[PDB]
Chains A and B, each alone.
Chain A
Amino acid sequence: TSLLGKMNSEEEDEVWQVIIGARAEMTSKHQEYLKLETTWMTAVGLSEMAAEAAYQTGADQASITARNHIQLVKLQVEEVHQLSRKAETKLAEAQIEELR
């Protein structure tokens, strides 16, 4: 977004090919992140099942363990995603301040 047109034509073509190749390589590298969402989905489902099953059996220590398990995995994944979305929100704020 920020450095188009300041340099000469050869570097313009160079940065365009860099954009194309880096976009392809970023898609290839981000192919790993699609499975993270699904494995967190199954982890959340399994943790909720464990909480329900431990409440049903009545094991207080196991029920607390499973409830804190779902809460802790939720906090960890939501906090890495929260760093990501804090960066995204900073990007959006920089966009809206740069546009206006």
Chain B
Amino acid sequence: EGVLDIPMISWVVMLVSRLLDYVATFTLAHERCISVVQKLVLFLLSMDFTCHADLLLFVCKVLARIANATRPTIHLCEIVNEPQLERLLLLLVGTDFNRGDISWGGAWAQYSLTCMLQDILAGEL
């Protein structure tokens, strides 16, 4: 039970994205940011025809920035479990969502997902 306030979510995400871009020229509590990151990545896997790729781009960017911003960098294992990781990769490569040249969320969404994954992996190493 619950309602997703999508307009509020979009406003807050873009505000947070601008702030995180500006700070990348205090710290972030990892023990608290872990829950935010988990909820964000769960939101990414819960998109459908009622959601748009425009919000997905900023969600991916904010997720990468938060994962790379906490002083102990968040690892991809701490973010998702095996089914969630398999679903996340299936968006990029799976034939359930990608049909011929028709990408899942478009070329921009595919590029954003790849950049998010690469940034999170680079943060760990």
The reply, when asked whether chain A contacts chain B directly with Cβ atoms under 8 A, is: no
